[PDB]
């Protein structure tokens, strides 16, 4: 077994330019479901809760944010302890 006949195929776009267009999320704020669809309040770079922006689960690309959020929220609401 020896290396013979190698192949290479890569694709990339050549767009050398920078401009404000995309927005980055900071963390989850609140959660609410409407029209059989669950949405989460996400904060975009520069944007504040004042704008009250909601994002669908499908678009939600940050599960960890919810995992931890539930931890804090749980304490807020009065429930029961279980192990």
């Amino acid at each position: 077994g020896s290396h013979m006949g190698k192949k290479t195929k890569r694709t990339a776009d050549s767009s050398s330019s920078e401009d404000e267009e995309e927005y980055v999320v900071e963390k989850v704020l609140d959660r609410r479901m409407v029209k059989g669809q669950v949405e989460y309040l996400l904060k975009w770079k520069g944007f504040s809760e004042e704008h009250n922006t909601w994002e669908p689960e499908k678009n939600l690309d940050c599960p960890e944010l919810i995992s931890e959020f539930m931890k804090k929220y749980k304490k807020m609401k009065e429930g029961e302890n279980n192990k």
Binding site: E21, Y23, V24, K58, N59, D61, C62
Partner: peptide, 18 residues
């Protein structure tokens, strides 16, 4: 430069007749 996962505001929405 961009490294962290980032996307634009809301994508994925068909515009049906009904």
């Amino acid at each position: 430069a961009r490294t962290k996962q980032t996307a634009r505001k809301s994508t994925g929405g068909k515009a049906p007749r009904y």
